[PDB]
Write a protein that binds this ligand. Sequence first.
Ligand SMILES: [Mg+2]
Ligand SMILES: [Mg+2]
Ligand SMILES: [Mg+2]
Ligand SMILES: [Mg+2]
Ligand SMILES: [Mg+2]
Ligand SMILES: [Mg+2]
Ligand SMILES: [Mg+2]
Lengths: 125, 201, 139, 109, 175
Amino acid sequence: FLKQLASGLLLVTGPLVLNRVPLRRTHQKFVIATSTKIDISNVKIPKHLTDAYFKKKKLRKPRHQEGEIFDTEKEKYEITEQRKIDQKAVDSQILPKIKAIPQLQGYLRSVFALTNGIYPHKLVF
Amino acid sequence: EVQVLVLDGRGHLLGRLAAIVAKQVLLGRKVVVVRCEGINISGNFYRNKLKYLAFLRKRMNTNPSRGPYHFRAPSRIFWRTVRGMLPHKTKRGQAALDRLKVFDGIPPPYDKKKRMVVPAALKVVRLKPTRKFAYLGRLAHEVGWKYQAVTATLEEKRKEKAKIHYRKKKQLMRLRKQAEKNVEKKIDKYTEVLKTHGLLV
Amino acid sequence: VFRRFVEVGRVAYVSFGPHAGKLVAIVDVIDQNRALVDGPCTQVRRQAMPFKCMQLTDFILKFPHSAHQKYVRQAWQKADINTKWAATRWAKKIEARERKAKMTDFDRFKVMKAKKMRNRIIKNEVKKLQKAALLKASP
Amino acid sequence: SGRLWSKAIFAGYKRGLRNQREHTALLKIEGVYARDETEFYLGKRCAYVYKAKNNTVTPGGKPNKTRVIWGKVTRAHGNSGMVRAKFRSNLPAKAIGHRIRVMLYPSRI
Amino acid sequence: KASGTLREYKVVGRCLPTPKCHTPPLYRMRIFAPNHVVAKSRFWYFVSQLKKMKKSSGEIVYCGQVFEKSPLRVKNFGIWLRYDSRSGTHNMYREYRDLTTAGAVTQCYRDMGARHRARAHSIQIMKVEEIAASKCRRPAVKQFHDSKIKFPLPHRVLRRQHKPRFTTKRPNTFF
RNA sequence: ACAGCCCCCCCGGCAGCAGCACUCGCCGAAUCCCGGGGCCGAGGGAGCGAGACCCGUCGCCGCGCUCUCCCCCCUCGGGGG
RNA sequence: GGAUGAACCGAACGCCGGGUUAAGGCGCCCGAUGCCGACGCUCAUCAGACCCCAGAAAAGGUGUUGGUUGAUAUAGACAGCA
RNA sequence: CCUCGGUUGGCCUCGGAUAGCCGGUCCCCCGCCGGGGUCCGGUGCGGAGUGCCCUUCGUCCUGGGAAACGGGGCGCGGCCGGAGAGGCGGCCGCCCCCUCGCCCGUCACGCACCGCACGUUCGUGGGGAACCUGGCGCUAAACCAUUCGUAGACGACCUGCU
Ligand SMILES: [Mg+2]
Ligand SMILES: [Mg+2]
Ligand SMILES: [Mg+2]
Ligand SMILES: [Mg+2]
Ligand SMILES: [Mg+2]
Ligand SMILES: [Mg+2]
Ligand SMILES: [Mg+2]
């Protein structure tokens, strides 16, 4: 977790080299806050990383009313070079702090699951 | 749960275990009760035998072939008790009843598996030590069950094989302890982690 | 047959109730079900306590029955019950249960990794010992 | 990659002895056998997932046989870890004794 | 009269002043009651039985709980009471061991209910007194007068019979 | 006495105080703050004012700032006293 | 709610959602004690188990548990043996 | 294709006692293993079901530890154990693979589908018709009709027929 945005959505990046999660918005209602933390103070989150930045973009539908020819083009979302630059800039200064504590990178590479013996109300996160 | 719950009937009180089993099968769980000849009933044997003889007396006067079916095997007795605690005349009750299997002794599907125990139905904790109790196997035998002797013989054979298996497991565990003693320089790095987080005192 | 007895000065561990997880000393006996009970160094003031929530330990203190907090506390502090209790296997099993319960998700992951490697090494050694023991051939 | 939901059993409807209120259901969450342990699951989304004959649209995927009746846990029931759940449509009676998933979605932790 | 954990109440009352006596005498009783409302009701019942008083003709000038002056000391209580059985009225002297007088009286009410099926409305507690250990008459109380009392807990029944409900290990009763 | 217990003292002192060492109450003009879950959203022209004109951000109630002037602390005019 | 029931107990009724109760209940049927409930009493070879209510008396018991009154006893009781 | 849906890791087992248990080890007896007597430990069960095992992001450079007498074969052939419902499990010989998979690190990459549900397993699920593709194998009864009369209201039954 990096910061809350203007709409209350969290901005997160489980670094893309670790678990393929880019700089991406998420909802605090649909996340579990664990107890493990890293000191991401004095790192520079870029100012343009805003809700308008992360808002989805669409192509359809100008100059087209009735569909006889499929408008399924552009459906392949494209990762912008600006997005790649921002991801590199954030990860280059988040990763050294992750490597500062042992096997946190392995923890971040792993995914969470419910074993048949464990129960979420008895789990300390 | 999603797997079968196997309960050892030895040392368990009839109605207590049957109530637990009825609730379990109504909650959509597969339950298998084994060694139903080891089930205990509180109260002395003569009184319990009198109860079952009264049950035998209850029959349809016009046509006993239609009347109450008095089952003599201990497994079938326990099954009828569970059916008494189930709503067996509805589809839900019949499905719950189908989710229950009962056996005398421990048959080959289940003699190689661990068996659970229900403490809330155990005689040792549910019954005062001075009180008298009856064995379901003896009651069934003296009310008409025909396979007490052969079940005892097969149970003795199963116990011999289980003793052999347990000796093998003890030998394996002794060897594992010896292995843990042998390798500890390359193990203490993880033993400290386990001890720190509470596993492996 | 019996080795632990309810008596004056016997130290008991509280299993449940408002004072669960604490050590107390039995000061007196009331009517077969209760005891006058005092933890002067484990922060349990003198009160009645049922025997059902008591689990007797192996420590016995030497003070007369219905003595005051002063004498019970001196008996507790001399031959310190706290350090001896912490040294016993019972208390460290309790502590292990507590620290297993308070383990977080990252700690669970690290324990999983350590236990994985430890079990693999132990299993390899067990296989080696089995193969070493299998070479028995003597008429 | 993982189960990510708690197992529960549709025990039955809220009811007296001879009256049944089908608008709310009783759920038995596995491992929760006391009333004080039910506070975690209050407000959590719950789903009755089943299969049918005709294909239905799947959000973010191809149509398949899977159907869901969504709901959520409202309050604790009894003293033994029962909970009450309200679903968008009343649960079918054939689901009694079957699986309900408690999805952890409205997380408060 | 129901029960709970009873409390001792000192209840002091008197008649209302009349142009026959301007200062009627004050009367005090010890009432063991769940609360002060029941305490006042029982006070009126008893003074109506003893003196010629009524709640309407008199007043209660004080009703205060009597705290036990040594709740940290085990002591022996003798209780003189009378009760109505199904076929008569009997006087009883009972003995209990407790820290508090009110607790001893509660023990007495429970024990009378258990042994004689005597409901609390049938029971009249007429005297409660702390007694010396040498003046006790009931062997069940006297057997605890041992400076070296010692006994084990022989057959400890499992009480956590549903946590877990299903298990592999059978419980142990020896500790 | 080579432990202790009870009562009165010639009188106590300190801390705490219905105790965050869970022994035993009744309460709140002697009572306030914060948080979580559940169910619900019925109504639809509220403008004494400009003589309304973008869809009345309106009434009652509780507040803040300006039409006075000094300073203080952070930002680089903005924010906080 | 009392299994069941014109009259009992609770409560009187438009169609619904939420909360809480009454009388009554909370092993399973069957919602709810899956409380580490409290103290005792009781073993029945016809046990007992809740208003109306759906079965019992006089009289007994060296079964057991309390209680009342009286009596004997180191000037040696009681019971056994002589 | 048609239809039926459930499920979302496993535990492969002493006997049991409860006013007692469990484990380990030296001497005696009986086939090199078990049973006794010592002795040593544990016992609010830690050789613990309040437990154990497995643990799913995947790869690429890349070092250190574990191993290297190691794992994989819907690969062949052989053997053994299991009968209470064995529907299962284990061990050898030959061959073909990789030195990878386990832990801690280096190094970057993968649709990063732009906050969102039915995701994730058992599973190559069960059942039914049908097409193609190969190999190895089989060529039968029942009933009616007839007959019998040990049978019989009729059915049914006992029988005979190169
Ligand atoms: Mg206070
Ligand atoms: Mg509206
Ligand atoms: Mg009715
Ligand atoms: Mg009736
Ligand atoms: Mg309502
Ligand atoms: Mg009922
Ligand atoms: Mg229920």
